[PDB]
Amino acid sequence: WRALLEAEKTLDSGVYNKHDLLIVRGQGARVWDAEGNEYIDCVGGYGVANLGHGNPEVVEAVKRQAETLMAMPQTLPTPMRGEFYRTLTAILPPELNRVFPVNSGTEANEAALKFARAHTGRKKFVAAMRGFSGRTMGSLSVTWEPKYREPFLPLVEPVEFIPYNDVEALKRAVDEETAAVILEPVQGEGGVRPATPEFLRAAREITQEKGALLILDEIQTGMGRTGKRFAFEHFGIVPDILTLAKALGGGVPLGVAVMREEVARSMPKGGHGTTFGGNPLAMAAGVAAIRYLERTRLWERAAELGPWFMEKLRAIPSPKIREVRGMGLMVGLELKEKAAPYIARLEKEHRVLALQAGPTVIRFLPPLVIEKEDLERVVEAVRAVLA
Amino acid sequence: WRALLEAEKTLDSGVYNKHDLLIVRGQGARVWDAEGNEYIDCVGGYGVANLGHGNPEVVEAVKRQAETLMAMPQTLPTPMRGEFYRTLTAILPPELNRVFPVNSGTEANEAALKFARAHTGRKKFVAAMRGFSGRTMGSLSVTWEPKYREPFLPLVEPVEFIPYNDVEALKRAVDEETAAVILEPVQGEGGVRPATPEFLRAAREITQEKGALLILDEIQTGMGRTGKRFAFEHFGIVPDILTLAKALGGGVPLGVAVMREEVARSMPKGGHGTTFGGNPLAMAAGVAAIRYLERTRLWERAAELGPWFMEKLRAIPSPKIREVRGMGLMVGLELKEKAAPYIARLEKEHRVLALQAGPTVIRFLPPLVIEKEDLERVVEAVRAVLA
Numbered sequence A, B: 001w002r003a004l005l006e007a008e009k010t011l012d013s014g015v016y017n018k019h020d021l022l023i024v025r026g027q028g029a030r031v032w033d034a035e036g037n038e039y040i041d042c043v044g045g046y047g048v049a050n051l052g053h054g055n056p057e058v059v060e061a062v063k064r065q066a067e068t069l070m071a072m073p074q075t076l077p078t079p080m081r082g083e084f085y086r087t088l089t090a091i092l093p094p095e096l097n098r099v100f101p102v103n104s105g106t107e108a109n110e111a112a113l114k115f116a117r118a119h120t121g122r123k124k125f126v127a128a129m130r131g132f133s134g135r136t137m138g139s140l141s142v143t144w145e146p147k148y149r150e151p152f153l154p155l156v157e158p159v160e161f162i163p164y165n166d167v168e169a170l171k172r173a174v175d176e177e178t179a180a181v182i183l184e185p186v187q188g189e190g191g192v193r194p195a196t197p198e199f200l201r202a203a204r205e206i207t208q209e210k211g212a213l214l215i216l217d218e219i220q221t222g223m224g225r226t227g228k229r230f231a232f233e234h235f236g237i238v239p240d241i242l243t244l245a246k247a248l249g250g251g252v253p254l255g256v257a258v259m260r261e262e263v264a265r266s267m268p269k270g271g272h273g274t275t276f277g278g279n280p281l282a283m284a285a286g287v288a289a290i291r292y293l294e295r296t297r298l299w300e301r302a303a304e305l306g307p308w309f310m311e312k313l314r315a316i317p318s319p320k321i322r323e324v325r326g327m328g329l330m331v332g333l334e335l336k337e338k339a340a341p342y343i344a345r346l347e348k349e350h351r352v353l354a355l356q357a358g359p360t361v362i363r364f365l366p367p368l369v370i371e372k373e374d375l376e377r378v379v380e381a382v383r384a385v386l387a
């Protein structure tokens, strides 16, 4: 197995920091390395494995559709596509009844941005500092982290950033020339920072007052992650365009930009498109993913386990912890120092896999099927590494 | 089945011209609609089904990996990724040994543009008129078609376009401020127009002389579509970055940008990324697709049937036919009048699905395993619809 690891390290572009281990299988919230070591996975492909590694229903839907049909364009209707369309819009506010399927989050946001420009006829985009929307140049233009943008300038203009949760800043920034505002209900990479009701209420109200669109990026908060089907169900606002991805396909690359009908209608024929977007394989996985989510009301586990996990985390007596925050099973532990060293030790010393969300924050995005025995061990592991 | 069709038509964003039918299954170069009618598929998901609908090896690879592991990020090595990396680089010239896996053709070019700027420190992109590179804003900036770019400007700048196959024009445009040239060995959407040896050689030489990077877009011409493994093999040149997608995963959403070592090396850690890019499921499918392509040397069927197929089309006694062109099984039939109605007749009266490549061109992108007897049927169908 060491030849595959070394081949991956060698042939990779090098843009990633690859860990010294090879993960070969996964079931539920557990994964195994090539040596047989079993880990608690709080990474879950960056919030993709919400339904759990090896989810039976999704795996089955994938196997069956793979035998039937995988390549069929948007110009040629295919049953699983219509089924995904009606299954996803049925668990959403009736205003969001138009779907543009894609293959990633960045493509979902790229779709939202384009649909927003064609509909308003405006150009400006307003986003929040510490926000992440994707790496493709369109989505990168509204992604804050200067490190990620500077090297590739100039990007798409004009874009304006405002502090997250700053009601007045958002109010001043949104004008008659703003095509749309794009925000995460809970900032992910930005450090697991929940939006305030006042902030999202202001975003909704002012975008309407100015004729601008509101794009809510729930690529990471979606599919039960925050304790509710979708984070927005926590605040009581309905955006003009909703973008989803990650867990939407239960593992299969899948994304979607759901929008109001008058928004979709403004897009000229052939104004946008995608080869893989809407393909039967992803569509089938999507139907399965959503059907599992709804039958099991999976967001509940995050709603019950989230607070429970965060409480135990808080109880950890270490002066290195500044704050424990999050919503449901989207948790962040902010330290008063670099988190990277502790993430490496959780993996090798405790077989616990975690993420970062800024250099001093440890982020947890475990599958929502994860049990309490596993969450408790993660806690103990964190406590042990911090001591 | 009608319920599912109306649901797709109604809930779709509406940016597509959806045909009046519902395709439920496929096998080889044939597909069936929900009524049981069988069609000869020359669309193939827009050149995705190169290996044929239902390819045993790919379908099987998908089933096995789906039960094993589907969600695992780039920071955590996984066997199928290392396998894909070496399997893909092994079928390419030595120089192309660094891989950045993605989820679509547009993401592949988006990565190519970003790596180019990072490596050269330059900003300018040079593309060809009638060229197509994708719908995300980055790739859209280098895509000609005004009706597609215009409504979304301003986009990524600066971008200069030159006439396809114009040697002197390309030379005058590529200078010490050019980050990269991006070209298709054979323009797809632009009407199936092959590059000439002089033009591509010119591109390779002038980019080297000026310190600019050469990006060859084989998202459409790749995987044995033009008669050889990759279209550049017919021209005797090695690009600096090769972008692929479409048939690369045998149906599963997959794309990639393969580049020379010094190019990848210039990219800052974390300078680019993607959630789904490089996931085990797409990697496993990618491995199976390549092994199949190599075992059968599938491009040979394209090289043999292509020329034969084109001669047959040119011999059709119809004054409406202007010219036939293409390479392997990437064929374009140019008519002296709108093609749309003949594509509708082909579908309804002969159950032959075909594409367009401009308003006056009928484009054919059938699985490479299509039977010679079926292409004859296609030629016959064309001769009848043009009567």
Ligand SMILES: Cc1[nH+]cc(COP(=O)(O)O)c(CN[C@@H](CCC(=O)O)C(=O)O)c1O
Binding pocket: A046, A104, A105, A106, A107, A109, A132, A133, A134, A135, A184, A188, A189, A217, A218, A219, A220, A245, A246, A355, B273, B274, B275, B276
């Ligand atoms: C809110 C959000 N929006 C858009 C994206 C982009 O979508 P996609 O094209 O499918 O990556 C991501 C990835 N953020 C995760 C991964 C980023 C990375 O690759 O690093 C994460 O923050 O862990 C997001 O967290």
Ligand SMILES: Cc1[nH+]cc(COP(=O)(O)O)c(CN[C@@H](CCC(=O)O)C(=O)O)c1O
Binding pocket: A273, A274, A275, A276, B046, B104, B105, B106, B107, B109, B132, B133, B134, B135, B184, B188, B189, B217, B218, B219, B220, B245, B246
């Ligand atoms: C050369 C080429 N490059 C990049 C892309 C972008 O890849 P993707 O992001 O996966 O679509 C395509 C799709 N072009 C076909 C489909 C466009 C459409 O949606 O229609 C086409 O040639 O019509 C290409 O033909």
